[PDB]
Amino acid sequence: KVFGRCELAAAMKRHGLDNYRGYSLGNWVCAAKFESNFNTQATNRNTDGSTDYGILQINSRWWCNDGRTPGSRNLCNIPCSALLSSDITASVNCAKKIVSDGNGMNAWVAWRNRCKGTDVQAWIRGCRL
Ligand code: NA
């Protein structure tokens, strides 16, 4: 599923991401735009041989099981394929664990490099939330 911007903003807010660990909804929408372009089916291989899955490009090195990431963990206790669903519940639940891990949203390098410190409220502009 390719989400619309406000469509994804509504879904993330319904699932309790607005101001989760102090991060406003536009931070999460901005992260999703630059991680996945709002595409639930996005997959990208990392140089370490792990893979990033779904709207928030959650990494198989730590968070989900894909069966092909030697020495990796599965801290969200989910198959990485569950992160590609049109229903973002699994991605959001797993994202809440990631952002709680100590470094907040710096875990998402695209958030740090492209969203952090920017006018992220622009990403929810015009949305009926
Ligand atoms: Na893994």
mmCIF file with all atom_site columns, C-alpha atoms and ligand atoms in Angstrom:
data_model
loop_
_atom_site.group_PDB
_atom_site.id
_atom_site.type_symbol
_atom_site.label_atom_id
_atom_site.label_alt_id
_atom_site.label_comp_id
_atom_site.label_asym_id
_atom_site.label_entity_id
_atom_site.label_seq_id
_atom_site.pdbx_PDB_ins_code
_atom_site.Cartn_x
_atom_site.Cartn_y
_atom_site.Cartn_z
_atom_site.occupancy
_atom_site.B_iso_or_equiv
_atom_site.pdbx_formal_charge
_atom_site.auth_seq_id
_atom_site.auth_comp_id
_atom_site.auth_asym_id
_atom_site.auth_atom_id
_atom_site.pdbx_PDB_model_num
ATOM   1   C  CA . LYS A 1 1   ? 0.000  0.000   0.000  1.00 0.00 ? 1   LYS A CA 1
ATOM   2   C  CA . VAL A 1 2   ? 1.225  3.512   -0.892 1.00 0.00 ? 2   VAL A CA 1
ATOM   3   C  CA . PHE A 1 3   ? -0.303 5.737   1.796  1.00 0.00 ? 3   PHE A CA 1
ATOM   4   C  CA . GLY A 1 4   ? -1.301 9.311   1.233  1.00 0.00 ? 4   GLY A CA 1
ATOM   5   C  CA . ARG A 1 5   ? 0.464  11.791  3.509  1.00 0.00 ? 5   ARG A CA 1
ATOM   6   C  CA . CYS A 1 6   ? -2.645 12.672  5.596  1.00 0.00 ? 6   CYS A CA 1
ATOM   7   C  CA . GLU A 1 7   ? -3.837 9.031   5.364  1.00 0.00 ? 7   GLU A CA 1
ATOM   8   C  CA . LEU A 1 8   ? -0.628 7.858   7.035  1.00 0.00 ? 8   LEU A CA 1
ATOM   9   C  CA . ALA A 1 9   ? -0.748 10.775  9.551  1.00 0.00 ? 9   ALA A CA 1
ATOM   10  C  CA . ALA A 1 10  ? -4.276 9.636   10.605 1.00 0.00 ? 10  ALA A CA 1
ATOM   11  C  CA . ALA A 1 11  ? -3.162 5.963   10.887 1.00 0.00 ? 11  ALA A CA 1
ATOM   12  C  CA . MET A 1 12  ? -0.049 6.835   12.957 1.00 0.00 ? 12  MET A CA 1
ATOM   13  C  CA . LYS A 1 13  ? -2.127 9.110   15.269 1.00 0.00 ? 13  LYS A CA 1
ATOM   14  C  CA . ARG A 1 14  ? -4.827 6.401   15.733 1.00 0.00 ? 14  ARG A CA 1
ATOM   15  C  CA . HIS A 1 15  ? -2.002 3.975   16.726 1.00 0.00 ? 15  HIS A CA 1
ATOM   16  C  CA . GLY A 1 16  ? -0.624 6.466   19.359 1.00 0.00 ? 16  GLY A CA 1
ATOM   17  C  CA . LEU A 1 17  ? 2.602  7.702   17.609 1.00 0.00 ? 17  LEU A CA 1
ATOM   18  C  CA . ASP A 1 18  ? 1.713  11.484  17.989 1.00 0.00 ? 18  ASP A CA 1
ATOM   19  C  CA . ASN A 1 19  ? 4.070  12.648  20.746 1.00 0.00 ? 19  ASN A CA 1
ATOM   20  C  CA . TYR A 1 20  ? 5.267  9.080   21.488 1.00 0.00 ? 20  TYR A CA 1
ATOM   21  C  CA . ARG A 1 21  ? 8.586  9.451   23.454 1.00 0.00 ? 21  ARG A CA 1
ATOM   22  C  CA . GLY A 1 22  ? 8.017  13.209  22.822 1.00 0.00 ? 22  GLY A CA 1
ATOM   23  C  CA . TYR A 1 23  ? 8.075  12.981  19.015 1.00 0.00 ? 23  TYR A CA 1
ATOM   24  C  CA . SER A 1 24  ? 5.283  14.965  17.281 1.00 0.00 ? 24  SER A CA 1
ATOM   25  C  CA . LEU A 1 25  ? 3.265  13.321  14.497 1.00 0.00 ? 25  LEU A CA 1
ATOM   26  C  CA . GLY A 1 26  ? 5.127  15.262  11.767 1.00 0.00 ? 26  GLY A CA 1
ATOM   27  C  CA . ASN A 1 27  ? 8.467  13.732  12.827 1.00 0.00 ? 27  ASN A CA 1
ATOM   28  C  CA . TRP A 1 28  ? 7.003  10.239  12.158 1.00 0.00 ? 28  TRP A CA 1
ATOM   29  C  CA . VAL A 1 29  ? 5.394  11.245  8.829  1.00 0.00 ? 29  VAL A CA 1
ATOM   30  C  CA . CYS A 1 30  ? 8.709  12.896  7.735  1.00 0.00 ? 30  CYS A CA 1
ATOM   31  C  CA . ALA A 1 31  ? 10.618 9.717   8.733  1.00 0.00 ? 31  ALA A CA 1
ATOM   32  C  CA . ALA A 1 32  ? 8.179  7.583   6.721  1.00 0.00 ? 32  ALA A CA 1
ATOM   33  C  CA . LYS A 1 33  ? 8.411  9.853   3.637  1.00 0.00 ? 33  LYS A CA 1
ATOM   34  C  CA . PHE A 1 34  ? 12.236 9.586   3.438  1.00 0.00 ? 34  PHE A CA 1
ATOM   35  C  CA . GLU A 1 35  ? 12.452 5.923   4.593  1.00 0.00 ? 35  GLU A CA 1
ATOM   36  C  CA . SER A 1 36  ? 9.749  4.402   2.337  1.00 0.00 ? 36  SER A CA 1
ATOM   37  C  CA . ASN A 1 37  ? 7.994  7.228   0.367  1.00 0.00 ? 37  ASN A CA 1
ATOM   38  C  CA . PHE A 1 38  ? 4.936  5.973   2.384  1.00 0.00 ? 38  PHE A CA 1
ATOM   39  C  CA . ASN A 1 39  ? 5.125  2.521   0.659  1.00 0.00 ? 39  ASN A CA 1
ATOM   40  C  CA . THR A 1 40  ? 4.347  -0.400  3.087  1.00 0.00 ? 40  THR A CA 1
ATOM   41  C  CA . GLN A 1 41  ? 6.096  -2.853  0.666  1.00 0.00 ? 41  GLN A CA 1
ATOM   42  C  CA . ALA A 1 42  ? 9.494  -0.977  0.631  1.00 0.00 ? 42  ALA A CA 1
ATOM   43  C  CA . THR A 1 43  ? 12.543 -3.271  1.236  1.00 0.00 ? 43  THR A CA 1
ATOM   44  C  CA . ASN A 1 44  ? 16.211 -2.148  1.061  1.00 0.00 ? 44  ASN A CA 1
ATOM   45  C  CA . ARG A 1 45  ? 19.339 -4.288  1.676  1.00 0.00 ? 45  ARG A CA 1
ATOM   46  C  CA . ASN A 1 46  ? 21.903 -2.763  4.068  1.00 0.00 ? 46  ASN A CA 1
ATOM   47  C  CA . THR A 1 47  ? 25.671 -3.106  3.456  1.00 0.00 ? 47  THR A CA 1
ATOM   48  C  CA . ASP A 1 48  ? 25.943 -5.366  6.601  1.00 0.00 ? 48  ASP A CA 1
ATOM   49  C  CA . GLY A 1 49  ? 23.574 -7.836  4.812  1.00 0.00 ? 49  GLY A CA 1
ATOM   50  C  CA . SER A 1 50  ? 20.558 -6.977  6.990  1.00 0.00 ? 50  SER A CA 1
ATOM   51  C  CA . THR A 1 51  ? 17.378 -5.648  5.299  1.00 0.00 ? 51  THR A CA 1
ATOM   52  C  CA . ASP A 1 52  ? 15.078 -2.733  6.150  1.00 0.00 ? 52  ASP A CA 1
ATOM   53  C  CA . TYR A 1 53  ? 11.317 -3.431  5.883  1.00 0.00 ? 53  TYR A CA 1
ATOM   54  C  CA . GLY A 1 54  ? 8.156  -1.356  5.430  1.00 0.00 ? 54  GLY A CA 1
ATOM   55  C  CA . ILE A 1 55  ? 7.013  2.232   5.986  1.00 0.00 ? 55  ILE A CA 1
ATOM   56  C  CA . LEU A 1 56  ? 9.663  2.892   8.688  1.00 0.00 ? 56  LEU A CA 1
ATOM   57  C  CA . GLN A 1 57  ? 12.425 0.653   7.195  1.00 0.00 ? 57  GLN A CA 1
ATOM   58  C  CA . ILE A 1 58  ? 12.807 -1.472  10.345 1.00 0.00 ? 58  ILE A CA 1
ATOM   59  C  CA . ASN A 1 59  ? 16.128 -3.406  10.272 1.00 0.00 ? 59  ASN A CA 1
ATOM   60  C  CA . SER A 1 60  ? 16.386 -7.281  10.459 1.00 0.00 ? 60  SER A CA 1
ATOM   61  C  CA . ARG A 1 61  ? 19.779 -6.869  12.341 1.00 0.00 ? 61  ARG A CA 1
ATOM   62  C  CA . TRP A 1 62  ? 17.839 -6.176  15.628 1.00 0.00 ? 62  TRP A CA 1
ATOM   63  C  CA . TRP A 1 63  ? 14.049 -5.960  15.256 1.00 0.00 ? 63  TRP A CA 1
ATOM   64  C  CA . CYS A 1 64  ? 12.434 -8.585  12.986 1.00 0.00 ? 64  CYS A CA 1
ATOM   65  C  CA . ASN A 1 65  ? 13.257 -12.061 11.686 1.00 0.00 ? 65  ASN A CA 1
ATOM   66  C  CA . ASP A 1 66  ? 13.883 -12.552 7.963  1.00 0.00 ? 66  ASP A CA 1
ATOM   67  C  CA . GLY A 1 67  ? 15.922 -15.852 8.263  1.00 0.00 ? 67  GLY A CA 1
ATOM   68  C  CA . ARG A 1 68  ? 18.887 -14.387 6.265  1.00 0.00 ? 68  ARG A CA 1
ATOM   69  C  CA . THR A 1 69  ? 20.565 -11.981 8.775  1.00 0.00 ? 69  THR A CA 1
ATOM   70  C  CA . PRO A 1 70  ? 23.249 -14.058 10.598 1.00 0.00 ? 70  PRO A CA 1
ATOM   71  C  CA . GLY A 1 71  ? 23.836 -13.122 14.271 1.00 0.00 ? 71  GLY A CA 1
ATOM   72  C  CA . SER A 1 72  ? 20.781 -10.884 14.265 1.00 0.00 ? 72  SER A CA 1
ATOM   73  C  CA . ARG A 1 73  ? 18.012 -10.443 16.830 1.00 0.00 ? 73  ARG A CA 1
ATOM   74  C  CA . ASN A 1 74  ? 14.177 -10.265 16.557 1.00 0.00 ? 74  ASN A CA 1
ATOM   75  C  CA . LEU A 1 75  ? 13.311 -7.857  19.397 1.00 0.00 ? 75  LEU A CA 1
ATOM   76  C  CA . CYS A 1 76  ? 9.806  -7.047  18.002 1.00 0.00 ? 76  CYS A CA 1
ATOM   77  C  CA . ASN A 1 77  ? 9.162  -10.857 17.825 1.00 0.00 ? 77  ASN A CA 1
ATOM   78  C  CA . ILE A 1 78  ? 7.734  -10.591 14.249 1.00 0.00 ? 78  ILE A CA 1
ATOM   79  C  CA . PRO A 1 79  ? 8.557  -11.914 10.798 1.00 0.00 ? 79  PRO A CA 1
ATOM   80  C  CA . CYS A 1 80  ? 9.936  -8.965  8.792  1.00 0.00 ? 80  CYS A CA 1
ATOM   81  C  CA . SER A 1 81  ? 7.268  -9.727  6.140  1.00 0.00 ? 81  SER A CA 1
ATOM   82  C  CA . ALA A 1 82  ? 4.628  -8.548  8.761  1.00 0.00 ? 82  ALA A CA 1
ATOM   83  C  CA . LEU A 1 83  ? 6.246  -5.080  8.383  1.00 0.00 ? 83  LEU A CA 1
ATOM   84  C  CA . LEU A 1 84  ? 5.050  -4.972  4.678  1.00 0.00 ? 84  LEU A CA 1
ATOM   85  C  CA . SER A 1 85  ? 1.322  -5.274  5.437  1.00 0.00 ? 85  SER A CA 1
ATOM   86  C  CA . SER A 1 86  ? -1.222 -2.609  4.331  1.00 0.00 ? 86  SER A CA 1
ATOM   87  C  CA . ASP A 1 87  ? -2.119 -2.533  8.101  1.00 0.00 ? 87  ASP A CA 1
ATOM   88  C  CA . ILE A 1 88  ? 0.694  -0.545  9.836  1.00 0.00 ? 88  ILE A CA 1
ATOM   89  C  CA . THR A 1 89  ? -0.046 -1.973  13.367 1.00 0.00 ? 89  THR A CA 1
ATOM   90  C  CA . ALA A 1 90  ? 3.104  -4.190  13.442 1.00 0.00 ? 90  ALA A CA 1
ATOM   91  C  CA . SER A 1 91  ? 5.396  -1.426  12.129 1.00 0.00 ? 91  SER A CA 1
ATOM   92  C  CA . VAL A 1 92  ? 4.018  1.060   14.672 1.00 0.00 ? 92  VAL A CA 1
ATOM   93  C  CA . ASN A 1 93  ? 4.313  -1.398  17.625 1.00 0.00 ? 93  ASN A CA 1
ATOM   94  C  CA . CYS A 1 94  ? 7.897  -2.183  16.594 1.00 0.00 ? 94  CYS A CA 1
ATOM   95  C  CA . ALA A 1 95  ? 8.750  1.528   15.999 1.00 0.00 ? 95  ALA A CA 1
ATOM   96  C  CA . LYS A 1 96  ? 7.617  2.248   19.626 1.00 0.00 ? 96  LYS A CA 1
ATOM   97  C  CA . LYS A 1 97  ? 10.242 -0.290  20.862 1.00 0.00 ? 97  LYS A CA 1
ATOM   98  C  CA . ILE A 1 98  ? 12.959 1.180   18.563 1.00 0.00 ? 98  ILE A CA 1
ATOM   99  C  CA . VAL A 1 99  ? 12.391 4.816   19.594 1.00 0.00 ? 99  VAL A CA 1
ATOM   100 C  CA . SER A 1 100 ? 12.424 3.701   23.276 1.00 0.00 ? 100 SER A CA 1
ATOM   101 C  CA . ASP A 1 101 ? 15.920 2.035   22.889 1.00 0.00 ? 101 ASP A CA 1
ATOM   102 C  CA . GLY A 1 102 ? 17.979 5.095   24.038 1.00 0.00 ? 102 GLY A CA 1
ATOM   103 C  CA . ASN A 1 103 ? 18.692 7.279   20.974 1.00 0.00 ? 103 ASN A CA 1
ATOM   104 C  CA . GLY A 1 104 ? 15.089 8.282   20.205 1.00 0.00 ? 104 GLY A CA 1
ATOM   105 C  CA . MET A 1 105 ? 14.483 8.848   16.513 1.00 0.00 ? 105 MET A CA 1
ATOM   106 C  CA . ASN A 1 106 ? 18.258 9.058   15.697 1.00 0.00 ? 106 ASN A CA 1
ATOM   107 C  CA . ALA A 1 107 ? 17.787 5.262   15.192 1.00 0.00 ? 107 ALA A CA 1
ATOM   108 C  CA . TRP A 1 108 ? 16.386 6.294   11.753 1.00 0.00 ? 108 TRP A CA 1
ATOM   109 C  CA . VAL A 1 109 ? 19.440 7.778   9.959  1.00 0.00 ? 109 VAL A CA 1
ATOM   110 C  CA . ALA A 1 110 ? 17.036 9.389   7.345  1.00 0.00 ? 110 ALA A CA 1
ATOM   111 C  CA . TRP A 1 111 ? 15.169 11.087  10.223 1.00 0.00 ? 111 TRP A CA 1
ATOM   112 C  CA . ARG A 1 112 ? 18.459 12.418  11.692 1.00 0.00 ? 112 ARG A CA 1
ATOM   113 C  CA . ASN A 1 113 ? 19.789 13.588  8.275  1.00 0.00 ? 113 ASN A CA 1
ATOM   114 C  CA . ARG A 1 114 ? 16.520 14.933  6.712  1.00 0.00 ? 114 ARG A CA 1
ATOM   115 C  CA . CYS A 1 115 ? 13.849 15.601  9.400  1.00 0.00 ? 115 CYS A CA 1
ATOM   116 C  CA . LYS A 1 116 ? 15.648 16.432  12.668 1.00 0.00 ? 116 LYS A CA 1
ATOM   117 C  CA . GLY A 1 117 ? 15.488 20.161  13.384 1.00 0.00 ? 117 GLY A CA 1
ATOM   118 C  CA . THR A 1 118 ? 13.288 20.941  10.313 1.00 0.00 ? 118 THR A CA 1
ATOM   119 C  CA . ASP A 1 119 ? 9.718  22.291  10.221 1.00 0.00 ? 119 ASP A CA 1
ATOM   120 C  CA . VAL A 1 120 ? 8.249  18.749  10.553 1.00 0.00 ? 120 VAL A CA 1
ATOM   121 C  CA . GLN A 1 121 ? 4.756  20.180  11.282 1.00 0.00 ? 121 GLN A CA 1
ATOM   122 C  CA . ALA A 1 122 ? 4.617  20.928  7.492  1.00 0.00 ? 122 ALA A CA 1
ATOM   123 C  CA . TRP A 1 123 ? 4.124  17.127  7.020  1.00 0.00 ? 123 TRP A CA 1
ATOM   124 C  CA . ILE A 1 124 ? 0.664  17.237  8.720  1.00 0.00 ? 124 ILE A CA 1
ATOM   125 C  CA . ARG A 1 125 ? -0.378 20.575  7.116  1.00 0.00 ? 125 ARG A CA 1
ATOM   126 C  CA . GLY A 1 126 ? -3.897 20.456  5.646  1.00 0.00 ? 126 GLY A CA 1
ATOM   127 C  CA . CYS A 1 127 ? -4.682 17.103  7.363  1.00 0.00 ? 127 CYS A CA 1
ATOM   128 C  CA . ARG A 1 128 ? -7.988 16.643  9.252  1.00 0.00 ? 128 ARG A CA 1
ATOM   129 C  CA . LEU A 1 129 ? -6.658 14.833  12.368 1.00 0.00 ? 129 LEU A CA 1
HETATM 130 NA NA . NA  B 2 .   ? 16.771 -10.608 12.690 1.00 0.00 ? 1   NA  B NA 1
#
